[PDB]
Design an enzyme around this catalytic site. Structure first.
Site, PDB file in Angstrom:
ATOM      1  N   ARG C  81      11.991  16.950 -21.414  1.00 14.23           N
ATOM      2  CA  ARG C  81      12.077  16.826 -19.970  1.00 14.23           C
ATOM      3  C   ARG C  81      10.755  17.125 -19.231  1.00 14.23           C
ATOM      4  O   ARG C  81      10.634  16.891 -18.021  1.00 14.23           O
ATOM      5  CB  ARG C  81      13.236  17.694 -19.457  1.00 14.23           C
ATOM      6  CG  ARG C  81      14.537  17.472 -20.282  1.00 14.23           C
ATOM      7  CD  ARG C  81      15.740  18.261 -19.751  1.00 14.23           C
ATOM      8  NE  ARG C  81      16.486  17.456 -18.795  1.00 14.23           N
ATOM      9  CZ  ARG C  81      16.321  17.497 -17.474  1.00 14.23           C
ATOM     10  NH1 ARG C  81      15.431  18.333 -16.930  1.00 14.23           N
ATOM     11  NH2 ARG C  81      17.058  16.702 -16.687  1.00 14.23           N
ATOM     12  N   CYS C 154      14.068  -2.313  -5.720  1.00 13.20           N
ATOM     13  CA  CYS C 154      14.765  -3.560  -5.909  1.00 13.20           C
ATOM     14  C   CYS C 154      14.900  -4.259  -4.561  1.00 13.20           C
ATOM     15  O   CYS C 154      14.668  -5.451  -4.445  1.00 13.20           O
ATOM     16  CB  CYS C 154      16.144  -3.292  -6.551  1.00 13.20           C
ATOM     17  SG  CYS C 154      17.125  -2.081  -5.609  1.00 13.20           S
ATOM     18  N   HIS C 181      24.692  -2.937  -0.724  1.00 11.87           N
ATOM     19  CA  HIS C 181      24.122  -2.541  -2.028  1.00 11.87           C
ATOM     20  C   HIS C 181      25.195  -1.994  -2.983  1.00 11.87           C
ATOM     21  O   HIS C 181      26.091  -1.249  -2.574  1.00 11.87           O
ATOM     22  CB  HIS C 181      22.923  -1.564  -1.821  1.00 11.87           C
ATOM     23  CG  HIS C 181      21.933  -1.517  -2.967  1.00 11.87           C
ATOM     24  ND1 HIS C 181      22.255  -1.073  -4.235  1.00 11.87           N
ATOM     25  CD2 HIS C 181      20.601  -1.765  -2.988  1.00 11.87           C
ATOM     26  CE1 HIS C 181      21.170  -1.103  -4.996  1.00 11.87           C
ATOM     27  NE2 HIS C 181      20.152  -1.502  -4.258  1.00 11.87           N
TER      28      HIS C 181
HETATM   29  N1  LIG Z   1      19.562   1.254 -10.429  1.00  6.44           N
HETATM   30  C1  LIG Z   1      18.890   0.494  -9.555  1.00  6.44           C
HETATM   31  O1  LIG Z   1      19.481  -0.551  -8.847  1.00  6.44           O
HETATM   32  C2  LIG Z   1      17.440   0.682  -9.248  1.00  6.44           C
HETATM   33  C3  LIG Z   1      16.653  -0.488  -9.135  1.00  6.44           C
HETATM   34  C4  LIG Z   1      15.280  -0.374  -9.134  1.00  6.44           C
HETATM   35  C5  LIG Z   1      14.704   0.875  -9.275  1.00  6.44           C
HETATM   36  N2  LIG Z   1      15.470   2.015  -9.399  1.00  6.44           N
HETATM   37  C6  LIG Z   1      14.783   3.301  -9.567  1.00  6.44           C
HETATM   38  O2  LIG Z   1      14.568   3.573 -10.941  1.00  6.44           O
HETATM   39  C7  LIG Z   1      14.734   4.964 -11.189  1.00  6.44           C
HETATM   40  C8  LIG Z   1      15.943   5.151 -12.122  1.00  6.44           C
HETATM   41  O3  LIG Z   1      17.151   4.568 -11.629  1.00  6.44           O
HETATM   42  P1  LIG Z   1      18.386   4.331 -12.577  1.00  6.44           P
HETATM   43  O4  LIG Z   1      19.386   3.526 -11.931  1.00  6.44           O
HETATM   44  O5  LIG Z   1      17.799   3.742 -13.906  1.00  6.44           O
HETATM   45  O6  LIG Z   1      18.791   5.871 -12.848  1.00  6.44           O
HETATM   46  P2  LIG Z   1      19.527   6.530 -14.119  1.00  6.44           P
HETATM   47  O7  LIG Z   1      20.123   7.748 -13.537  1.00  6.44           O
HETATM   48  O8  LIG Z   1      20.521   5.655 -14.808  1.00  6.44           O
HETATM   49  O9  LIG Z   1      18.404   6.868 -15.172  1.00  6.44           O
HETATM   50  C9  LIG Z   1      17.552   7.985 -15.128  1.00  6.44           C
HETATM   51  C10 LIG Z   1      17.264   8.335 -16.576  1.00  6.44           C
HETATM   52  O10 LIG Z   1      16.231   9.309 -16.557  1.00  6.44           O
HETATM   53  C11 LIG Z   1      16.626  10.432 -17.337  1.00  6.44           C
HETATM   54  N3  LIG Z   1      15.927  11.667 -16.902  1.00  6.44           N
HETATM   55  C12 LIG Z   1      16.132  12.449 -15.774  1.00  6.44           C
HETATM   56  N4  LIG Z   1      15.239  13.445 -15.796  1.00  6.44           N
HETATM   57  C13 LIG Z   1      14.460  13.299 -16.923  1.00  6.44           C
HETATM   58  C14 LIG Z   1      13.397  14.029 -17.454  1.00  6.44           C
HETATM   59  N5  LIG Z   1      12.894  15.088 -16.834  1.00  6.44           N
HETATM   60  N6  LIG Z   1      12.777  13.590 -18.616  1.00  6.44           N
HETATM   61  C15 LIG Z   1      13.284  12.488 -19.288  1.00  6.44           C
HETATM   62  N7  LIG Z   1      14.342  11.759 -18.786  1.00  6.44           N
HETATM   63  C16 LIG Z   1      14.901  12.181 -17.609  1.00  6.44           C
HETATM   64  C17 LIG Z   1      18.140  10.452 -17.308  1.00  6.44           C
HETATM   65  O11 LIG Z   1      18.626  11.171 -18.417  1.00  6.44           O
HETATM   66  C18 LIG Z   1      18.491   8.945 -17.239  1.00  6.44           C
HETATM   67  O12 LIG Z   1      18.797   8.402 -18.517  1.00  6.44           O
HETATM   68  C19 LIG Z   1      14.938   5.624  -9.819  1.00  6.44           C
HETATM   69  O13 LIG Z   1      13.701   6.042  -9.257  1.00  6.44           O
HETATM   70  C20 LIG Z   1      15.542   4.504  -8.999  1.00  6.44           C
HETATM   71  O14 LIG Z   1      15.359   4.541  -7.584  1.00  6.44           O
HETATM   72  C21 LIG Z   1      16.838   1.929  -9.395  1.00  6.44           C
END
Ligand SMILES: NC(=O)c1ccc[n+]([C@@H]2O[C@H](COP(=O)([O-])OP(=O)(O)OC[C@H]3O[C@@H](n4cnc5c(N)ncnc54)[C@H](O)[C@@H]3O)[C@@H](O)[C@H]2O)c1
Ligand SMILES: NC(=O)c1ccc[n+]([C@@H]2O[C@H](COP(=O)([O-])OP(=O)(O)OC[C@H]3O[C@@H](n4cnc5c(N)ncnc54)[C@H](O)[C@@H]3O)[C@@H](O)[C@H]2O)c1
Ligand SMILES: NC(=O)c1ccc[n+]([C@@H]2O[C@H](COP(=O)([O-])OP(=O)(O)OC[C@H]3O[C@@H](n4cnc5c(N)ncnc54)[C@H](O)[C@@H]3O)[C@@H](O)[C@H]2O)c1
Ligand SMILES: NC(=O)c1ccc[n+]([C@@H]2O[C@H](COP(=O)([O-])OP(=O)(O)OC[C@H]3O[C@@H](n4cnc5c(N)ncnc54)[C@H](O)[C@@H]3O)[C@@H](O)[C@H]2O)c1
Lengths: 337, 21, 337, 336, 336, 20
Positions: C81, C154, C181
């Site tokens: 982490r 996005c 959304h």
């Molecule tokens: N889901 C969407 O529609 C969307 C689209 C574009 C961008 N994003 C952005 O992308 C990022 C992730 O979104 P998501 O939907 O994939 O979230 P998510 O919650 O599914 O994924 C986050 C991942 O990061 C991990 N994580 C958290 N803290 C960590 C650490 N300290 N070290 C290692 N791993 C760690 C979690 O275990 C998880 O698997 C965010 O910043 C979000 O705004 C989201």
């Protein structure tokens, strides 16, 4: 004076609990404190507005930086992940409702007594050897000598009451259990990391098989059922209300109406207010805010081969269970010394 | 198992909560 | 000479990104490591099995207890982490996809560079002064000397392409936007604690107003738009796919089809592969796995008073965006000096 | 006391009944329900409601052609042809028309044949039917008019705060998007429908659909004629809907001036119809809101001094049904 | 090469077409479709599917009365009365009866009156209509039979493992709960239905409903007669279902032993029909499963030696529709 | 055309209901 109650973990149960207590007109309890990691702003908001219970019919406002106000009654709010550091001695707390889900053994729950409380009721199966009670099954056997107790799980509180009557009345040889359960806060909203690969999956998209101990746990409150029950849970995309599906082989031959009349006598007598029988063709949502731990769906009662009884019961897993937490806390308060 | 050992110390996290119903 | 890539945060985006990259032919990238809080059990399982994407058509399984293999390509799976401690220098990592949501400033993001990675692409908007790119819009202004870059949101990837065309061709004076959304992992499943009292509320039960910085982040990739837009989001109880509703006053008086024609022309030319125009009467689910950043719903375009222009665009927030992360990562690779 | 029959005992019909039931000293008295189902359905569905929960009243069948709701007997008939309904027999003064199929004069007028003297249609009307929004133009209601419409849910949300904007700032033009709870006209799973978007599984999709509400506001506020267009996007909530209005206005302004104009109307002319909410709420929290329109004051923006964006919440079933009751009360008090 | 028409272009009718399209060297040729809808619906709902996603084929209109799928033209007619259909005209050998309403000899027979030779009903029949589960008793099918049933989805899941369990452990008695995705007989919001439970908003509720699936297994496995009952619970998922069977068996046994028996059935006699899942999957993961039954092995239990509980997954749409195609390949391979 | 005709006679059915 009234026993002073603090709620630790102001989540779904902590929050249902406060709303359940508030609606009671005979209570020996006084809710004077709440701890959750999120602060007074959350406490107040999420109590007034609930997506499952709707809007609390009460005047809920902040009272300073460190409290809220509920219909004029002031209630303090603190935020410490460490029960040892909570101001329970300072505030005169008699009982803690453990609704965090993470302090489920003596040494963790114990930290509250260390901080100044005298009793802890855990809103979950206990870890290890904790005395476990189900109001209407074995809660009469609680003794004021026990500082940390458990109210078991919502599934166990639905199941035990109708298992009491089945065993008493017909005699259970063995049995098996599926609970079709509303998704809970332990599941992920969308597929994401979890120690359990099925709780990892999108709660609202999926039928999710999950581990339960509800079926062995009934043996803690009904010792005659030890070794006799097993079961599973299927989590499904509803936000609340669940149902248990019990199949048992009984020793006395019977037939559906016999089984239902029996649940029906009990409902009138020793399980008044805990067990109920439903003779209308209703659906999950209709059992919201049911105060009964268990509601038999009489139309679904079956018997195959004279001795394989299938029984279906409904429970509001958040509200009805919290009404039982309230009731155990009334038993604790009535037995004070 | 990485996540199992994490969850011992952090039982209240997203990846750890395990409600036995 | 293929660039060695690591995924930090194997979540919705981290996983969509790998599957997106897997489907490309003759990628300049090789993905050689993953890091998440979670470990191989999770990695391997949440990649094969996906509630939103369905099963991954590739042979995915563990190799050892610290790797997985995907059609025989071995990729290392670590779990720390703290990004400072990651084995990037050892593995010779060139780019990190910062997919955690928690290292979106320079400080956090820079820790990968400390650990030995040469470049970080943040799958989210940056906090503070991080160079930001939308492919099809300003990604040609990318300079290889920039070690930390953002691919924006996005929503910003859907909006900016068609804002670019509208401003170019009609001249945007001021405007406002709302995005409807799909719920994301950042919202709670049931009502519970969140710093945002709206994202606290059960996702799958609610229409949830929340903020978006998409409106002011468009000005980062198209500077003429500075000060001219504002917007909001409404999260809805769908698991994936979102829609932007843009309303702008424009300087050139017009009508709906001239506006639609102008997007059609862009889609043929300078926005090939990025912007699409759909003439059939579709619904959210039909855009799943759309490789376009923006798909205009032509039948919904409207003009009121010759110069107030309403346009509705569809995007797959997970897959579409991640296809743009591969594209940005390819642009990094192609400009590698 | 005015006698009412509810034709189409569906979401509005059943909401209508409970709205009226909540009323004190109603000038109305509902004596009949007609629907495609029988007393079996009427009684059960009145009592158990997945959206509203359990009706706090003693609901049972009386005989085989009626129900009783707290001791009041209410006839239940089941004829799909309104010409054949016992309205003359039962002495029905006014019909609440909730089937969604008899929305023109020829159709709704079948009730008049049958015995009824007036018809309130709970939908936009087809053709030359008078259309009233309570708090906007329903003072203008003329008893000479036998068949009227209470407009759509959206138009009732939207008209009242549009009335304020045009009055106080003057709308030049504008555009509307409603993000709407799914309704009974969408399919549960993909299946045939005349509208190929409404064919699509309701609880799985964002579904653009056709509104007329932006033009209907012109019926109750003629000054807006030609000035608005909108669309609708149905989303997987079972109830409660939101309007996003963007207008260019004459008078240059700022967000709080706009929100203040709404708060001012809320305590005066639009008392009971328009509300302003200053809390960070979500859809489920406006369930059972009795206001036609609830302004989310924190989402109010003004761009470039004259481009105003306004978001407003409405319980599409309950709040609309409270307005139907209000219009029936207006009808009954303007009885000649 | 047999000529097929699809009567009822619904969830099964279109799953059926897509399933057939996916087959290699089918002995069937699809030449017509009938629906209450029109070419406009048929071509759109075939190409775009909320549950299956976009059909990867070139689907387009081809006249005012047909569609082209991958070059191959397919007539689209539209008549609620099977007698009136042009089966004689177009040379239709076999009708896929997917309307859900011609399930007796008298109704389904109209297809033959109209000129077809065989009707395959995609639901249980009414009357002693010959009923078949592929892998269980489909081998007993005789060309002598003009009208036949493919049974329910629940019965195609249940019967194959109940076969293995009775064979290898001997079923004394037993009971069943199917936890079932919502289907189109259910309402979207509370509204009239003759079943007061199916009336209720499908995507909001757990809804218990009657199933005849337990007693219907005894038609394809007569040995099971009198021995089973069941219920169904409909839940807010749009596809994919699970059967939960509790049986008392004669032969004392243990979970792993029961599972191994299933795994052996899967390699041998129920190959392509019964599968065993040894990974902790959830419902969405069984979408487009070609198996009628996938045993969830970690859920297998045995209580008190002789009470076995087995959990099985099925895609109620695709999986069943794959069975429908198999039954029609059996009808075709035994043509006289 | 075919479903439209069905719907004038049968406005109240699943394939026809159009609210707004
Ligand atoms: N889901 C969407 O529609 C969307 C689209 C574009 C961008 N994003 C952005 O992308 C990022 C992730 O979104 P998501 O939907 O994939 O979230 P998510 O919650 O599914 O994924 C986050 C991942 O990061 C991990 N994580 C958290 N803290 C960590 C650490 N300290 N070290 C290692 N791993 C760690 C979690 O275990 C998880 O698997 C965010 O910043 C979000 O705004 C989201
Ligand atoms: N929801 C149900 O139907 C149900 C029924 C019976 C029992 N329970 C049990 O109660 C427990 C809580 O369930 P819930 O549904 O309320 O979950 P929840 O997630 O809504 O509530 C947990 C609360 O505890 C807080 N918390 C976590 N660690 C904390 C700590 N260190 N100090 C203070 N607060 C902390 C969280 O912020 C949250 O508010 C679980 O063990 C669950 O099994 C739940
Ligand atoms: N649901 C909303 O938010 C909303 C709001 C405002 C207005 N409306 C309008 O109200 C009308 C109905 O909408 P709903 O949501 O109540 O619909 P609904 O489908 O729940 O109710 C229609 C009712 O009329 C019955 N019916 C159909 N044809 C009939 C006939 N010929 N004779 C007698 N009964 C018949 C149906 O069985 C059903 O009970 C529509 O015009 C709709 O647009 C709906
Ligand atoms: N969906 C499932 O899980 C499933 C599985 C196995 C079997 N079945 C059975 O298949 C049958 C159809 O179910 P479905 O889910 O596909 O339903 P559906 O409602 O989607 O389809 C029925 C189709 O037939 C049409 N129809 C109705 N009456 C007609 C007539 N007179 N002439 C021509 N078309 C007519 C309807 O317009 C519709 O398109 C049911 O009896 C069901 O029990 C369903």
């Amino acid at each position: 004076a009234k026993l002073k109650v603090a709620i630790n973990g102001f989540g779904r149960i902590g929050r249902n609990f406060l709303r359940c207590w508030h609606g009671r007109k005979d209570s020996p309890l006084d809710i004077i404190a709440i701890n959750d990691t999120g602060g007074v702003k959350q406490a107040s908001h999420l109590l007034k507005y609930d997506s499952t219970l709707g809007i609390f019919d009460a005047d809920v406002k902040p009272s300073g930086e460190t409290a809220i106000s509920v219909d004029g009654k002031i209630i303090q709010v603190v935020s410490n992940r460490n029960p040892s550091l909570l101001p329970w001695k300072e505030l005169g707390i008699d009982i803690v409702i453990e609704g965090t889900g993470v302090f489920v053994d003596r040494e963790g729950a114990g930290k509250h007594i260390e901080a100044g409380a005298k009793k802890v009721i855990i809103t979950a199966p206990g870890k290890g050897d904790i005395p476990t009670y189900v109001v209407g099954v074995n809660a009469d056997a609680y003794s004021h000598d026990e500082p940390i107790i458990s109210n078991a799980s919502c599934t166990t509180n639905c199941l035990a009451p109708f298992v009491k009557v089945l065993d008493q009345k017909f005699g259970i040889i063995k049995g098996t259990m599926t609970t079709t359960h509303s998704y809970t806060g332990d599941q992920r909203l969308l597929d994401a990391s979890h120690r359990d690969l099925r709780r990892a999956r999108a709660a609202a998209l999926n039928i999710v098989p999950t581990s339960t101990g509800a079926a062995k746990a009934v043996a803690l409150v009904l010792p005659n059922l030890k070794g006799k029950l097993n079961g599973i849970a299927l989590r499904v995309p509803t936000p609340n209300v669940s149902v248990v599906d019990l199949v048992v082989q009984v020793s006395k031959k019977t037939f559906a109406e016999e089984v239902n009349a029996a649940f029906r006598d009990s409902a009138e007598k020793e399980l008044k207010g805990i067990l109920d029988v439903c003779d209308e063709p209703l659906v999950s949502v209709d059992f919201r805010c049911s105060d009964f731990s268990t509601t038999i769906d009489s139309s679904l009662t079956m018997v195959m081969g004279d001795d394989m009884v299938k029984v279906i019961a409904w429970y509001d897993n958040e509200w009805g269970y919290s009404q039982r937490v309230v009731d155990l806390a009334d038993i604790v308060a009535n037995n004070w010394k | 198992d990485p996540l199992e050992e994490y969850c011992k110390d952090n039982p209240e996290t997203n990846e750890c909560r395990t409600y036995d119903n």
